[PDB]
Amino acid sequence: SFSGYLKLTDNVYIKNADIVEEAKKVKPTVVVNAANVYLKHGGGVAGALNKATNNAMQVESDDYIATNGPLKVGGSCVLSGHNLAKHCLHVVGPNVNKGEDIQLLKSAYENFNQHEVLLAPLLSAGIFGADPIHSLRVCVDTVRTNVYLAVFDKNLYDKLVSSFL
């Protein structure tokens, strides 16, 4: 199972780790992707997860979009986890760099409640432009299922733990 995680609450855990390396080691039932509405996995967590699948995640995602159209900001879809997990829960957090509504972050975290345990990044953090301290607060106040957060950046991980209320 998951190892080396710091317990924040009854159900939220955090570790300074590369989510791709974490997924390969654990092979969780669900890995969460920080997706956009088009499932275009170009950069950040999405680009890294997709590259680990040798682009199989993008091929599957393009077929999903051709059939279903784009996701909503705050929405999600369950696709294959490929070599990383049983499933990948593609969750769209608001991208504040694309002028999207930050109040949608709670809606985005609500998707995690449909899965008993997940390996996840902080939604809307990184290249999505939101404050990761705010994202962690929304996560612990929204997610009731067991979420193992992988924070890539060591300095951000320390800031998150040392400032956690």
Ligand X SMILES: CNC(=O)Cn1cnc2ccccc21
26 belongs to the binding site for ligand X (CB under 6 A): no
| Residues in 124-153 at the binding interface with ligand X, rule: CB under 6 A | 152
Compute how many other C-beta atoms are within 10 angstroms of the C-beta atom of residue 157. 19
- One of 14, 37, 48, 122 touching ligand X (CB under 6 A): 48
Size of the site for ligand X (CB under 6 A): 9
d(CA 152, CA 75): 23
What minimum distance in Å lies between the beta carbon of 68 and ligand X?
A: 26
> Side-chain half-sphere of 116: how many Cα atoms within 13 Å?
2
Maximum Cα interatomic distance, the chain, rounded to a whole number of Å: 45
Element (H, E) at 14: strand 12-16
d(CA 159, CA 156): 5
What minimum distance in Å lies between the beta carbon of 66 and ligand X?
A: 26
What minimum distance in Å lies between the beta carbon of 121 and ligand X?
A: 6
91 belongs to the binding site for ligand X (CB under 6 A): no
Name the residues that contact ligand X, by CB under 6 A.
18-20, 44-45, 48, 51-52, 152
